[PDB]
Amino acid sequence: QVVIGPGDRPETGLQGQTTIEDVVSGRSKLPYHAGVRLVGRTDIWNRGGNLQLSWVDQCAYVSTFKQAGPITANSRSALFLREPAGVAVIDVRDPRAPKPVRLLRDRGSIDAVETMHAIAAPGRKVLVAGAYSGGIAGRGEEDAAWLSIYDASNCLNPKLQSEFKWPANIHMVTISPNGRRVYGTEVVPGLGSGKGGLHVLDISDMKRPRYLGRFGVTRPNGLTAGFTPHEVSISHDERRIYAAVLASETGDVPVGASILASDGDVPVENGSVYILDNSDIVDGRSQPKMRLVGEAKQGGFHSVVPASINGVPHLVGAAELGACPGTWPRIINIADEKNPKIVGEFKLQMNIKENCDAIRFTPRKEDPYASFIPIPDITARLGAVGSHFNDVDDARNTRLGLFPFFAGGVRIVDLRDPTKPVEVGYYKPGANPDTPLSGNGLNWTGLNDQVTDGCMSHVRYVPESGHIWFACVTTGFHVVELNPDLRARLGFPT
Amino acid sequence: QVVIGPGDRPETGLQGQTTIEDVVSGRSKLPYHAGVRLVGRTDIWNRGGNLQLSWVDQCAYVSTFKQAGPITANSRSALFLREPAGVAVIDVRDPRAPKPVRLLRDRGSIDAVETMHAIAAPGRKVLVAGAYSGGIAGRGEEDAAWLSIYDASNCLNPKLQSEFKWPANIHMVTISPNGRRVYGTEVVPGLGSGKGGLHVLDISDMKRPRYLGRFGVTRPNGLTAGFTPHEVSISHDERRIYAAVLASETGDVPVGASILASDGDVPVENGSVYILDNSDIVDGRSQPKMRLVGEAKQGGFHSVVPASINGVPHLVGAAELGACPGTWPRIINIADEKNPKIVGEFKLQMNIKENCDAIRFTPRKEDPYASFIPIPDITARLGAVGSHFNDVDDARNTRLGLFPFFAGGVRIVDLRDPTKPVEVGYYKPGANPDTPLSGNGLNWTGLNDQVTDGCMSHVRYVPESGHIWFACVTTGFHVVELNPDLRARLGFPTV
């Protein structure tokens, strides 16, 4: 429950809503927030087009995504890939004043979109960024699925070690805890057919990457089939891979509407979460083998991450975006990994269909053009309110969900009762119109950059300071923190 | 054939195209033109949201359309109907400097959209404007299908005479040549079913209009059925009605895809043109009918107008908008009104499918998301290049097609060979971002007001001066004229 206080600038409509009233008046261009305060912010050379966030030490890395389109060839998108496109390196040594220092514009980093990860490991700090658009069949080598691999030993100045070409389009990457392997998901072109897999690259020698292969899922029946995971997270000892999965080649997982549509509704499906035994790779066994340990149907197809709630291991998964009522995270008990169980969900008021209808300017039953000339309601011209990543504060001691909801901003959720997650705060960053990467009315995401903004990045929590890092599309990189009152109340130290 | 000279500012890509190059560089915000020159322009208090153009003497009237949606109740749209929404009255006594002087914000004029017409007749100057969104079932009287009727005898100051409530949604209106009747089309809710008709209002007494009823189409076989005409034009003697028709209740007229769909997908259909005998109403026959004389299949569902090319009677009809290759005018010979024949078509290069494909950033065959997550090519995020009205210079002595192509601007077409219409000029007005009526990214038409503009209005030609009048959504009211060399080539007399 959000208890609104003196510092707060609360939502003026339904929970999760950007009101047309605020859009017309200009109010929507300023931030809305409850339970939090802003520590620092940078618009990253006022560039727009920001997507993913990764980090090493006190450095933030923020990717960009081109307006030309998610799988459009980079070779045809030169008009959209000039500076300031690229992975921005941000100095957060003073979180009051995060400062963009440089731009990484190599084959993988110039248009990384969601494909970027970094990790600090023993003797190794590594940032990788890949061409999200790369490797579509029939294109030239310039448009291949490049992965730029950087030594981030000095996080302010990552050094290109090599550029590897995947033999397929890779959608999202996750570096192993030891920093020696990159796991890259393949969702294209298979998509709903489930004909894809999980690729693994050995980067033990960062200058000589060694491809290990493309893995399907091996079930207790002894059979191996493709799947289309969007992202994976990895257990501390690398023996478990938690995958957010769109579909399985077995046909096991139902597939639904476009996450970027508006009517027809037609729900977007949640997909499935896989718990995968990865011990073969960890122990260097020949012909590995990712074995299905357990499955949570409806677990979330876009991102799944580990959590520990009151000492009980959990996962938080979600689909992404979607026309109202959108998509939202589910809380998954995995105390018995062979039998994961959804025990809770976090929904905003704008994730209830009755509410989507109620706010419409034109009731659907009154629209004679509904089939003949479909026209989205004016309320559908702002941006989806639904998940785009779904992180937690601390995998080892979870209290908070840190949930980007795209146009709904970042939602701060008390997860201490996994069966009943409740919002305790939020931050909607306002608007930043006319940036070079999000302007000119050329967006494809549905986000109205004229009047609002969306947050799409992974979220960091720094336990020693209580700081929370995230990026939003036009408004850039933010450091926020919980109000001291709310923080003390929630069980946090300091 | 466009002959480029000084000081044209020609298109930089295919004929009809707004290049992404020009969008990125900013070039797309400035005008493009050939064969013509700008005489004068007003952005109408910089308001945006402009649609229809009507005129009386040296006055222009320009309507407004709300971002809240074409069919949305006006009572729910207060945030979109404040000034400067309304029918703007523009003084064009000096066409070098047209000036907006007043705003009509009555029930019919506050959100007229396409529903506005004006006529200067003997003893009579009339302007009518109607609530395009009005009369949707299940709504209150505030949201009824109002028609505001103005005495425009002093054209700079139209005086409201009455507000009439039609018993259905009226889509477009056409005042009769004698200024005594208004013909209002009904396309909603029937649309593709063809269940609709043509309504007639007698405005002989402008303060006390009299409803005449709702008419279907009676065929030679004696049977009457509904139709969904979008607009009509009327012969000089009122005895013929030329109707652009979306569908017929008989199922006779193929209906296709959404004109606002980004990407195609199923083709957009052109609809039919009907020639209707309106003698019963004109002569006061009991139980009057509108009798079908001839039909031009694929003639155009949105607008059809009369023309006379080398003394031979024609019609110019078109559908509207549509994903590339859009829609475009067809030239219809009606020498035998019982057997109308399409004899020519005017296409821009952007009305050729192969050209649409050639400019795509991402080929449809390369897109693994084509069905799973449909995303319009970036070239489809600018605005349709397809007809939105399709007028001629002089119905009685036609040389030019004056063809608004929405995002393609206004196209000027030599119609002297009806079998081969060819372009001789064009005007694309640039862009005017951040207007109160078109900004905030809240548009529903597909028009990208950040980088370009769309021209959607009827077009006037003034033979005495050679001036051409049109309105565009954000850039407003324009007066242009033909280069003198172009006039000679076309056979216009000098003036």
Short mmCIF file of N, CA and C in Angstrom, two decimals, chain A residues 313-387:
data_model
loop_
_atom_site.label_atom_id
_atom_site.label_comp_id
_atom_site.label_asym_id
_atom_site.label_seq_id
_atom_site.Cartn_x
_atom_site.Cartn_y
_atom_site.Cartn_z
N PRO A 313 13.55 -20.16 -1.53
CA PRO A 313 13.92 -19.77 -2.90
C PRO A 313 12.70 -19.56 -3.79
N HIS A 314 12.71 -18.47 -4.55
CA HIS A 314 11.62 -18.16 -5.46
C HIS A 314 12.19 -17.75 -6.81
N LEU A 315 11.30 -17.55 -7.78
CA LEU A 315 11.65 -16.89 -9.03
C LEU A 315 10.58 -15.85 -9.30
N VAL A 316 10.96 -14.76 -9.97
CA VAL A 316 9.99 -13.78 -10.43
C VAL A 316 10.09 -13.75 -11.94
N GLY A 317 8.99 -14.06 -12.62
CA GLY A 317 9.00 -14.05 -14.07
C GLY A 317 7.90 -13.16 -14.62
N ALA A 318 8.05 -12.75 -15.87
CA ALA A 318 7.00 -12.00 -16.53
C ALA A 318 7.12 -12.07 -18.04
N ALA A 319 5.98 -11.89 -18.70
CA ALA A 319 5.93 -11.61 -20.13
C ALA A 319 6.32 -10.14 -20.33
N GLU A 320 5.84 -9.50 -21.39
CA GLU A 320 6.19 -8.09 -21.60
C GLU A 320 5.11 -7.30 -22.32
N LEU A 321 5.01 -6.02 -21.95
CA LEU A 321 4.18 -5.04 -22.65
C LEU A 321 2.73 -5.52 -22.80
N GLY A 322 2.19 -5.40 -24.01
CA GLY A 322 0.84 -5.85 -24.27
C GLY A 322 -0.18 -4.73 -24.19
N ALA A 323 -1.16 -4.77 -25.09
CA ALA A 323 -2.29 -3.86 -25.00
C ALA A 323 -3.00 -4.09 -23.68
N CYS A 324 -3.56 -3.01 -23.12
CA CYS A 324 -4.30 -3.06 -21.87
C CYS A 324 -5.24 -4.27 -21.91
N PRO A 325 -5.19 -5.13 -20.88
CA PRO A 325 -4.58 -5.01 -19.54
C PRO A 325 -3.10 -5.36 -19.42
N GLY A 326 -2.39 -5.47 -20.54
CA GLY A 326 -0.94 -5.64 -20.48
C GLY A 326 -0.49 -6.99 -19.94
N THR A 327 0.68 -6.99 -19.30
CA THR A 327 1.31 -8.17 -18.71
C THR A 327 1.97 -7.76 -17.40
N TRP A 328 2.18 -8.71 -16.49
CA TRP A 328 2.68 -8.36 -15.17
C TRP A 328 3.40 -9.53 -14.52
N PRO A 329 4.22 -9.27 -13.48
CA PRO A 329 5.02 -10.36 -12.92
C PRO A 329 4.24 -11.37 -12.07
N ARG A 330 4.73 -12.60 -12.06
CA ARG A 330 4.21 -13.61 -11.16
C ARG A 330 5.34 -14.13 -10.26
N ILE A 331 4.98 -14.47 -9.02
CA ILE A 331 5.95 -14.88 -8.01
C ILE A 331 5.90 -16.40 -7.93
N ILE A 332 7.05 -17.05 -8.10
CA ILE A 332 7.09 -18.49 -8.26
C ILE A 332 7.87 -19.16 -7.14
N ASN A 333 7.20 -20.00 -6.36
CA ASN A 333 7.87 -20.78 -5.32
C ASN A 333 8.60 -21.95 -5.96
N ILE A 334 9.90 -22.07 -5.68
CA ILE A 334 10.71 -23.17 -6.21
C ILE A 334 11.47 -23.90 -5.10
N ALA A 335 10.85 -23.96 -3.93
CA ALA A 335 11.39 -24.74 -2.82
C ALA A 335 11.55 -26.19 -3.24
N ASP A 336 10.63 -26.66 -4.07
CA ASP A 336 10.77 -27.94 -4.76
C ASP A 336 10.96 -27.64 -6.24
N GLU A 337 12.21 -27.63 -6.69
CA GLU A 337 12.52 -27.21 -8.06
C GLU A 337 11.90 -28.12 -9.12
N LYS A 338 11.57 -29.35 -8.74
CA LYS A 338 10.90 -30.26 -9.66
C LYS A 338 9.43 -29.87 -9.82
N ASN A 339 8.92 -29.09 -8.87
CA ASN A 339 7.52 -28.66 -8.91
C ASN A 339 7.33 -27.19 -8.55
N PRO A 340 7.84 -26.29 -9.41
CA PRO A 340 7.64 -24.86 -9.16
C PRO A 340 6.16 -24.51 -9.19
N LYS A 341 5.79 -23.46 -8.47
CA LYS A 341 4.39 -23.15 -8.24
C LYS A 341 4.23 -21.63 -8.20
N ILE A 342 3.35 -21.09 -9.04
CA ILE A 342 3.02 -19.67 -8.95
C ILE A 342 2.19 -19.46 -7.70
N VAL A 343 2.65 -18.59 -6.81
CA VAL A 343 1.96 -18.35 -5.54
C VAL A 343 1.42 -16.93 -5.40
N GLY A 344 1.83 -16.05 -6.30
CA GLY A 344 1.35 -14.67 -6.26
C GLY A 344 1.58 -13.93 -7.57
N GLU A 345 0.84 -12.84 -7.76
CA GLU A 345 1.02 -11.97 -8.92
C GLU A 345 0.98 -10.53 -8.45
N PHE A 346 1.71 -9.66 -9.14
CA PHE A 346 1.59 -8.22 -8.90
C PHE A 346 0.92 -7.53 -10.09
N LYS A 347 -0.26 -6.97 -9.87
CA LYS A 347 -1.02 -6.31 -10.91
C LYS A 347 -1.29 -4.87 -10.50
N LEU A 348 -1.30 -3.95 -11.47
CA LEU A 348 -1.75 -2.59 -11.24
C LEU A 348 -3.23 -2.51 -11.61
N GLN A 349 -3.90 -1.43 -11.20
CA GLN A 349 -5.28 -1.25 -11.62
C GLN A 349 -5.39 -1.26 -13.14
N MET A 350 -4.39 -0.73 -13.84
CA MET A 350 -4.41 -0.73 -15.30
C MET A 350 -4.12 -2.10 -15.93
N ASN A 351 -3.95 -3.12 -15.08
CA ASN A 351 -3.82 -4.50 -15.55
C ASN A 351 -5.13 -5.28 -15.40
N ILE A 352 -6.21 -4.54 -15.14
CA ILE A 352 -7.55 -5.11 -15.05
C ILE A 352 -8.36 -4.67 -16.27
N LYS A 353 -8.86 -5.64 -17.05
CA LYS A 353 -9.61 -5.34 -18.27
C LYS A 353 -10.77 -4.35 -18.08
N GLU A 354 -11.55 -4.51 -17.00
CA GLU A 354 -12.67 -3.60 -16.73
C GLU A 354 -12.20 -2.15 -16.66
N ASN A 355 -11.01 -1.94 -16.12
CA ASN A 355 -10.42 -0.60 -16.04
C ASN A 355 -9.95 -0.07 -17.40
N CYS A 356 -9.32 -0.92 -18.21
CA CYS A 356 -8.96 -0.54 -19.57
C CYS A 356 -10.17 -0.02 -20.34
N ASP A 357 -11.30 -0.72 -20.20
CA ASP A 357 -12.53 -0.31 -20.89
C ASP A 357 -13.09 0.99 -20.32
N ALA A 358 -13.09 1.09 -19.00
CA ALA A 358 -13.75 2.22 -18.34
C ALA A 358 -13.11 3.56 -18.71
N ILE A 359 -11.80 3.57 -18.93
CA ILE A 359 -11.12 4.83 -19.21
C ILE A 359 -11.23 5.26 -20.68
N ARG A 360 -11.82 4.40 -21.52
CA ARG A 360 -11.90 4.70 -22.96
C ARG A 360 -12.76 5.92 -23.24
N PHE A 361 -12.33 6.74 -24.19
CA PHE A 361 -13.12 7.89 -24.63
C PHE A 361 -14.26 7.42 -25.51
N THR A 362 -14.01 6.37 -26.28
CA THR A 362 -15.07 5.79 -27.10
C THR A 362 -15.35 4.34 -26.72
N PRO A 363 -16.50 4.11 -26.07
CA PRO A 363 -16.90 2.76 -25.67
C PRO A 363 -16.89 1.86 -26.90
N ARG A 364 -16.36 0.65 -26.78
CA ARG A 364 -16.22 -0.24 -27.93
C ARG A 364 -17.57 -0.56 -28.57
N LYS A 365 -18.60 -0.68 -27.74
CA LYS A 365 -19.94 -1.01 -28.23
C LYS A 365 -20.56 0.14 -29.02
N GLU A 366 -19.95 1.32 -28.94
CA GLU A 366 -20.45 2.49 -29.64
C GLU A 366 -19.66 2.77 -30.92
N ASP A 367 -18.69 1.92 -31.23
CA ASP A 367 -17.81 2.17 -32.36
C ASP A 367 -18.21 1.37 -33.60
N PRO A 368 -18.90 2.03 -34.55
CA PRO A 368 -19.38 1.34 -35.75
C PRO A 368 -18.24 0.91 -36.66
N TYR A 369 -17.05 1.48 -36.46
CA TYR A 369 -15.88 1.19 -37.30
C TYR A 369 -14.98 0.11 -36.73
N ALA A 370 -15.36 -0.49 -35.61
CA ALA A 370 -14.50 -1.41 -34.86
C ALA A 370 -13.80 -2.47 -35.72
N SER A 371 -14.54 -3.05 -36.67
CA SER A 371 -13.96 -4.05 -37.57
C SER A 371 -13.55 -3.45 -38.92
N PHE A 372 -14.37 -2.54 -39.44
CA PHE A 372 -14.17 -2.01 -40.79
C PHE A 372 -12.92 -1.13 -40.91
N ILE A 373 -12.77 -0.20 -39.96
CA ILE A 373 -11.58 0.64 -39.87
C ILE A 373 -11.19 0.72 -38.39
N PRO A 374 -10.41 -0.26 -37.92
CA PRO A 374 -10.00 -0.27 -36.51
C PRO A 374 -9.17 0.97 -36.16
N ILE A 375 -9.56 1.67 -35.10
CA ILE A 375 -8.84 2.85 -34.66
C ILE A 375 -8.70 2.76 -33.16
N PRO A 376 -7.44 2.71 -32.67
CA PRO A 376 -7.20 2.64 -31.23
C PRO A 376 -7.81 3.84 -30.51
N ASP A 377 -8.35 3.60 -29.32
CA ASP A 377 -8.83 4.70 -28.49
C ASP A 377 -7.71 5.67 -28.22
N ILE A 378 -8.03 6.92 -27.95
CA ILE A 378 -6.98 7.89 -27.66
C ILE A 378 -6.17 7.47 -26.43
N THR A 379 -6.79 6.71 -25.53
CA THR A 379 -6.07 6.22 -24.35
C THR A 379 -5.01 5.16 -24.69
N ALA A 380 -5.08 4.62 -25.91
CA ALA A 380 -4.11 3.60 -26.35
C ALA A 380 -2.92 4.21 -27.09
N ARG A 381 -2.84 5.54 -27.12
CA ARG A 381 -1.80 6.24 -27.87
C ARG A 381 -0.74 6.83 -26.95
N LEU A 382 -0.51 6.19 -25.81
CA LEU A 382 0.43 6.70 -24.82
C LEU A 382 1.60 5.74 -24.65
N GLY A 383 1.29 4.47 -24.42
CA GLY A 383 2.29 3.43 -24.32
C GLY A 383 1.81 2.35 -23.37
N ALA A 384 2.22 1.11 -23.63
CA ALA A 384 1.77 -0.03 -22.84
C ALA A 384 2.14 0.12 -21.37
N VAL A 385 1.22 -0.28 -20.49
CA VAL A 385 1.52 -0.41 -19.07
C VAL A 385 1.59 -1.90 -18.75
N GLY A 386 2.80 -2.44 -18.80
CA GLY A 386 3.01 -3.86 -18.60
C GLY A 386 4.49 -4.10 -18.43
N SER A 387 4.85 -5.30 -17.99
CA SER A 387 6.25 -5.57 -17.64
C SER A 387 7.23 -5.37 -18.77
#
